[PDB]
Design a binder for this molecule. Structure first.
Ligand SMILES: COc1cc(Nc2nccc(N(C)c3ccc4c(C)n[nH]c4c3)n2)cc(OC)c1OC
Length: 282
């Protein structure tokens, strides 16, 4: 019921003749673009634009319109990919304009920096450290506490859906399955009972932490995702600690993977706790 939602064109509508489309960013289609005056200043800024494919079904146009209204409803936060404007009027294609994250998804970035990482550390001069990793974790937690306060469940929280921007700002994206009230990231109650709550997102956040402190490895390495895996997960079997974690961060993963959803930390508690780890590293 996010079709009903209002669209204030005065606030959001951006003229199509001030958008210059660039290279595709993959796969609905996302394209890199240049927008003049989208923050109301006299500047040409790089943005990302979701538009439709050459087919134009009603359900596809409905879906994208729903994405837009959900983003308007959610509101702005530093640690989500924010809406800048949209092109919705009868002139041309439906286009949703968001902030461009120039480094792409966090899983891929982290993988590309495995020989450019050192923990806690004589002027290497470009490398990732534990500080960065804990900083990214803290930021996603902040983004999730925000989404939780807007009464959303993400339902697909994974490093590939975290985007990296300039100045080490990470942003939660993919709100196409965000609701109001892939198995290796899924909580047991969501696997077995089909449940989704903010506390199920906490479990996924735990898998995301494992992804961060493995530098973008795939969860449950070499494990068959079958009826046994789900047995083991129900029982209480968990991933071992990844290669680049601290003890404290692995403990937080285990906490997020509590069997009882109400016994997992809330995102506010994770923001508190991760904030303390960040300052302890520093
Ligand atoms: C993941 O691929 C890259 C992304 C990006 N950067 C980027 N920044 C912001 C958004 C965004 N995306 C994909 C997007 C935008 C709008 C929507 C909407 C309405 N729904 N979903 C959206 C998804 N992609 C940069 C890359 O290399 C530099 C990538 O590697 C090719």
């Amino acid at each position: 019921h996010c079709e009903r939602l209002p669209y204030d064109a005065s606030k959001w509508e951006f003229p199509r003749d001030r958008l210059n489309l660039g290279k595709p960013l993959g796969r609905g289609q996302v394209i890199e673009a240049d927008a003049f005056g989208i923050d109301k200043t006299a500047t040409c800024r790089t943005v990302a634009v979701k538009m439709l494919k050459e087919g134009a079904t009603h359900s596809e146009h409905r879906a994208l319109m729903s994405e837009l209204k959900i983003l308007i409803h959610i509101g702005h936060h530093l640690n989500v990919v924010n809406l800048l404007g949209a092109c919705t009027k009868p002139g041309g294609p439906l286009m949703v304009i968001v902030e461009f994250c120039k480094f792409g998804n966090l899983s891929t970035y982290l993988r590309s920096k495995r020989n450019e990482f050192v923990p806690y550390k004589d002027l290497y001069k470009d490398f990732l450290t534990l500080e960065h990793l804990i900083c990214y974790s803290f930021q996603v937690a902040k983004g999730m506490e925000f989404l939780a306060s807007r009464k959303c469940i993400h339902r697909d929280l994974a490093a590939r859906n975290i985007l990296l921007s300039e100045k080490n700002v990470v942003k939660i994206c993919d709100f196409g399955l965000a609701r109001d009230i892939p198995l290796k990231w899924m909580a047991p109650e969501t696997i077995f009972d089909r449940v989704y709550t903010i506390q199920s997102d906490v479990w996924s956040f735990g898998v995301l932490l494992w992804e961060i402190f493995s530098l973008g490895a795939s969860p449950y390495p070499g494990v068959k995702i079958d009826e046994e895996f789900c047995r083991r997960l129900k029982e209480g079997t968990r991933m071992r600690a990844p290669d680049y974690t601290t003890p404290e961060m692995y403990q937080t993963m285990l906490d997020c993977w509590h069997g009882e959803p109400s016994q997992r930390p809330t995102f506010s508690e994770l923001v508190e706790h991760l904030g303390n780890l960040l300052q302890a590293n520093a």
